[PDB]
Design an enzyme around this catalytic site. Structure first.
Site, PDB file in Angstrom:
ATOM      1  CG  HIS A  84      -0.453   0.248   2.512  1.00  0.00           C
ATOM      2  ND1 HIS A  84       0.095  -0.738   3.305  1.00  0.00           N
ATOM      3  CD2 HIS A  84      -0.413   1.386   3.246  1.00  0.00           C
ATOM      4  CE1 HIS A  84       0.479  -0.212   4.456  1.00  0.00           C
ATOM      5  NE2 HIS A  84       0.181   1.076   4.445  1.00  0.00           N
ATOM      6  CG  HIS A  86       0.206   4.588   4.750  1.00  0.00           C
ATOM      7  ND1 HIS A  86      -0.680   3.954   5.595  1.00  0.00           N
ATOM      8  CD2 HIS A  86      -0.435   5.692   4.296  1.00  0.00           C
ATOM      9  CE1 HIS A  86      -1.803   4.648   5.655  1.00  0.00           C
ATOM     10  NE2 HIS A  86      -1.680   5.707   4.876  1.00  0.00           N
ATOM     11  CG  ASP A  88       4.413   1.145   6.740  1.00  0.00           C
ATOM     12  OD1 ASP A  88       3.750   1.654   5.814  1.00  0.00           O
ATOM     13  OD2 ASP A  88       3.920   0.374   7.590  1.00  0.00           O
ATOM     14  CG  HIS A 149      -3.464  -0.301   7.239  1.00  0.00           C
ATOM     15  ND1 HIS A 149      -3.170   0.154   8.506  1.00  0.00           N
ATOM     16  CD2 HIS A 149      -2.597   0.321   6.404  1.00  0.00           C
ATOM     17  CE1 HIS A 149      -2.170   1.017   8.440  1.00  0.00           C
ATOM     18  NE2 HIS A 149      -1.804   1.134   7.177  1.00  0.00           N
ATOM     19  CG  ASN A 180      -1.587   6.384  10.166  1.00  0.00           C
ATOM     20  OD1 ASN A 180      -2.620   7.055  10.205  1.00  0.00           O
ATOM     21  ND2 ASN A 180      -0.614   6.620   9.291  1.00  0.00           N
TER      22      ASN A 180
HETATM   23  O1  L8J Z   1       0.634   6.032  13.734  1.00  0.00           O
HETATM   24  C1  L8J Z   1       1.014   4.919  13.877  1.00  0.00           C
HETATM   25  C2  L8J Z   1       1.549   4.229  12.805  1.00  0.00           C
HETATM   26  C3  L8J Z   1       2.010   2.922  12.927  1.00  0.00           C
HETATM   27  C4  L8J Z   1       2.545   2.362  11.601  1.00  0.00           C
HETATM   28  P1  L8J Z   1       1.174   1.493  10.672  1.00  0.00           P
HETATM   29  O2  L8J Z   1      -0.080   2.329  10.718  1.00  0.00           O
HETATM   30  O3  L8J Z   1       1.571   1.272   9.230  1.00  0.00           O
HETATM   31  O4  L8J Z   1       0.873   0.160  11.316  1.00  0.00           O
HETATM   32  C5  L8J Z   1       1.907   2.304  14.228  1.00  0.00           C
HETATM   33  C6  L8J Z   1       2.285   0.987  14.675  1.00  0.00           C
HETATM   34 BR1  L8J Z   1       3.068  -0.127  13.290  1.00  0.00          BR
HETATM   35  C7  L8J Z   1       2.138   0.501  15.960  1.00  0.00           C
HETATM   36  C8  L8J Z   1       1.584   1.318  16.921  1.00  0.00           C
HETATM   37 BR2  L8J Z   1       1.372   0.658  18.731  1.00  0.00          BR
HETATM   38  C9  L8J Z   1       1.197   2.597  16.565  1.00  0.00           C
HETATM   39  C10 L8J Z   1       1.354   3.081  15.245  1.00  0.00           C
HETATM   40  N1  L8J Z   1       0.930   4.342  15.053  1.00  0.00           N
HETATM   41 ZN    ZN Z   2      -0.279   2.186   6.300  1.00  0.00          ZN
HETATM   42 ZN    ZN Z   3       2.396  -0.534   8.588  1.00  0.00          ZN
END
Ligand code: L8J
Ligand code: ZN
Ligand code: ZN
Ligand code: ZN
Ligand code: ZN
Length: 233
Positions: A84, A86, A88, A149, A180
């Site tokens: 996707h 984002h 990461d 997601h 997120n």
């Molecule tokens: O804002 C965020 C973003 C991520 C990266 P993601 O949305 O791609 O999973 C995140 C993750 Br991995 C774990 C946690 Br606990 C809080 C998070 N808070």
């Molecule tokens: Zn994401």
């Molecule tokens: Zn992620």
């Protein structure tokens, strides 16, 4: 052995974890908002080449990921797929492209990445525009389960090893709260998870976007977390 944890990976470094024969996961760490997070990708052997799934979350991480792949497996990474839009998953595409890797993503991911100002995978993946669509890409199958997601998230299955890579649409068991979800579809997320379960019931290893792998239980766990967050609990 012991799966690489966020406390065992230095800043800017990448670890590889062989899930099955010809199937690795790459683990990197990123830090923001005062906390540090681990992140998973996939590496699937494709004959004498390698197919990479997702970047290592950042240009420096991705450069180290290619160097680690080169030191460990020693086979050329010819193609890469971002699940996707984002950072990461596409952060580091420019590093991949500069090293001669052909980068791929769905037209939905490329569009949303450009709107977000993120790095843009060059090639477009056709045949994944509708929920339930599946196409074969090298040694893996790409699957669009629907919005979860993010509206564009894909999952990756390796039929040679029965490995399912859910990306950020799948949570690890230790994670009990959504992250997120600014671009998420909470209303469609559980239905998209069921499409994954219906399409890959034989999967033996399930890789979340972050954290420890497990079995197909990670799907129902994600559904429970999303439903709990939906009701604000
Ligand atoms: O804002 C965020 C973003 C991520 C990266 P993601 O949305 O791609 O999973 C995140 C993750 Br991995 C774990 C946690 Br606990 C809080 C998070 N808070
Ligand atoms: Zn994401
Ligand atoms: Zn992620
Ligand atoms: Zn090309
Ligand atoms: Zn659970």
């Amino acid at each position: 052995g012991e799966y690489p944890t966020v406390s065992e990976i230095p800043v800017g470094e990448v670890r590889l974890y062989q899930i099955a024969d010809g199937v690795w996961s790459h683990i990197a760490t990123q830090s923001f908002d005062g906390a540090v997070y681990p992140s998973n990708g996939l590496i699937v052997r494709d004959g004498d080449e390698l197919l990479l799934i997702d970047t290592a979350w950042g240009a420096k991480n991705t450069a180290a990921l290619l160097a680690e792949i080169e030191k460990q497996i020693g086979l050329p990474v010819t193609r890469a797929v971002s699940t996707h839009f984002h950072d990461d998953r596409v952060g580091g595409v420019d590093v991949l492209r500069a090293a001669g890797v052909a980068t791929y993503a769905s037209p939905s991911t490329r569009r949303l990445a450009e709107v977000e100002g993120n790095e843009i995978p060059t090639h477009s993946l056709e045949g994944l525009s509708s929920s339930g669509d599946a196409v074969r890409f090298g040694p893996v199958e790409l699957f669009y389960p629907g919005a979860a997601h993010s509206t564009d998230n894909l999952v990756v299955y390796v039929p040679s090893a029965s490995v399912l890579y859910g990306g950020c649409a799948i949570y690890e068991l230790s994670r009990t709260s959504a992250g997120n979800v600014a671009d998420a579809d909470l209303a469609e997320w559980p239905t998209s998870i069921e499409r994954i379960q219906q399409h890959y019931p034989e999967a033996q290893f399930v890789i979340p976007g972050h954290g420890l792998p497990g079995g197909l239980d990670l799907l129902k766990h994600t559904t429970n977390v999303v439903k709990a967050h939906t009701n604000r609990s």
